[model samples]
Target: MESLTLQPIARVDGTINLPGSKSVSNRALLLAALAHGKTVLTNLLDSDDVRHMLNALTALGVSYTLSADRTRCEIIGNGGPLHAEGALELFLGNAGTAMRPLAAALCLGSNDIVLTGEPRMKERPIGHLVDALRLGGAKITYLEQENYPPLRLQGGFTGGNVDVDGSVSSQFLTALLMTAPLAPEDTVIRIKGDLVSKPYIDITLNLMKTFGVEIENQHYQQFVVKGGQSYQSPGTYLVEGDASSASYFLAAAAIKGGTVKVTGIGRNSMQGDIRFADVLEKMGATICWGDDYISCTRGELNAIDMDMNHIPDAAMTIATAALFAKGTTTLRNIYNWRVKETDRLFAMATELRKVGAEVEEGHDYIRITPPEKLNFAEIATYNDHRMAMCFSLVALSDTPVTILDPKCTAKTFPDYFEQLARISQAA
Candidate 1:
């Protein structure tokens, strides 16, 4: 595996232009492909996940023109359900954004589709989403494990009252919501348990509204959508900069900073991960918020104890940022971490200990107590983008850290290290 070793950085101070959000980019692409008129999307994420969605759309006969840099796209909407004759296979890589939504969207039309992804994708549970789709009359069969991916989806969704377990991942509900409007009958979705990552549901609803579809959110416990409604193109949509991606830079500055400004997402941003800045502030980072930007300055960093289920993706950054804190930081209610990318809970705990932190890995929480002196170690990334990005903060310490398989960041932020280097000054 290719690895990158970083020298200890004394400080980080610069402005970073964040890439478009993976969540919003893929959601917009799918909605744009299903909308009535052509849609022009600006600042689309040029990452593997978004590319997987684009590739799937092309395979399903949705026409779109991508810019030379792939950051702008013009999608000619299909105006309704995507129709393709015969059987088709879509290899969605490890993009949950692509696999989950496409699994539901593909069921809106009569197409024999097989949705498969990377090895880790196969391990991530899809049974909850599959059960919800099956309840809504979707003909989906697991090609491999009972509840995992490598699914065979046959068009048979006639939406009505559907019960979806919400404790696992919000993407299942998002999948159902986006597909609900196109169903033959009105869709009423009821949640079975406490919804994790509730803010992500807001992203899905907001984007759906942008595409001219409205969902009645019943206190995050249920949702109602009218059937037989087609999405109307908004003509133009701008994907916000990835709030999750911004977490690394924000945390970097918070840990060691002359101050860093991250543009393209701000206080008014719709992404839930934007709340990550609040957590940093609680940890004693000085934060300045603007309509389209946020700046973080170093302070006397202190540890925090909080339930971070709302910002699961960004919370991972906190695990590493805890290394620079004065006390133990406890992040709770993030059990879903076990089901993402590569069992993040275990992966995070193991790596933190390697760097000399005392870590308590609970089933749904991680408590980190920073070491008095940091240790140099080869950090394993496990092909999880966040792991690679989060551990890069180890470089902020006096000890140089080596990141194994650093290219794993391609799943989201492709040039994460280079961006970090731009703002970093060596001790």
Candidate 2:
């Protein structure tokens, strides 16, 4: 289990049922816990990230039960912002989804809560969110380093106007938006810069609507939410399949396929990563789209040079797909990758070069060109799940790829390699 080596795959053909999205599952879990009635959540992702949220909910006094498979969760809503007496500490690992949103939610009532995470999580910036929360009178202190995690929270937020820098991560704005409706007074949030991951904000807004709280979004610059409101459970919520997780498989078929189909997400999916399929189609993959499934058939692949800021997570798969492309593949406007699980831009460029791709490591972008021949190499995953999953695409080439610390995929897609093997045929 130190590393996993994938044999060179000649063809991929089959249907894969993707797990529920990490984004939707975490968001729905929080909203359901804060709502007024019991919520039955189906197809919930069974992963480390979701488990962190579930564990934190348990600590904060929200009750929920899981099925034998851990995918169906029935939570009895607290009917308002979470409250727990005395001091409580939650170690959320590196789950930014749990850390950021929970930071904002914990501010609705008076409580002593300390949120800490993995070492990398401490390095990831949370100051922007802390600054915004402070403007609304939330008492939060940096326990270790400034602008990062290991935060101490003492609830005091009574929201009004606050400004959050959007250039870093959209999660700050998402945290604020989710907590805005329940503030003692109406809340108005203004974005200080160009927001990265605009599509993720759409997902947040749509989920809020589903839970019965509405906000007035003035473009992407401002948002206004009424005070004294609470989420109302929708009785039962079904989480959509993870579009980001589908990228590796979809790219597999595009690179070498008899054709591959991924179900559980489609045209009506709420996730923006679904747009990754469009990028594949533009790169010469034959695509079939249905309401609940997407199929990819191999075609002559060509390089793509475009801004991929919208689908940041799925865009990592594109970096590997570049190996099969005929020209230079340039992914632009992705500076935020530096702040993810690892410095993704640097990690991606480093690993790509090891596999015989000509890679340009830019400050905010990466340009990759496929080598005439690939070199078998050991890929360091940097404890990042995406890196392990993305590099699996190298198996489609004639060269076998060894992924170090492959278990890191437990963060979002625990059975990723198995799923890939199900559809892959070795040469």
Q: For residues 348-373, could you state the per-residue lDDT of candidate 1 as single tens digits?
A: 99999999999999999999999998
Q: Which stretches of candidate 1 lie over 4 Å from their true place?
A: none
Taking the tens digit of each residue's C-alpha lDDT, what string does model 2 give over 1-427? 4999999998999999999899999999999999999999999999999998898888778899999989999999999988854656888877899999999988887967899877888988899999999999899988888999898899989998899998999999999999889888888899997999999999999999999999999999999989899999999998998999999999999999978999999889999999999999999998888899888999878999999999999999999999999999999999999998999999999999999998999999999988998989999999999999999999998899999999999999999999999999764
Measured against the true structure, the TM-scores of the candidates, in listed sequence, are 0.98, 0.99
Lowest lDDT block of 10, candidate 1:
82-91
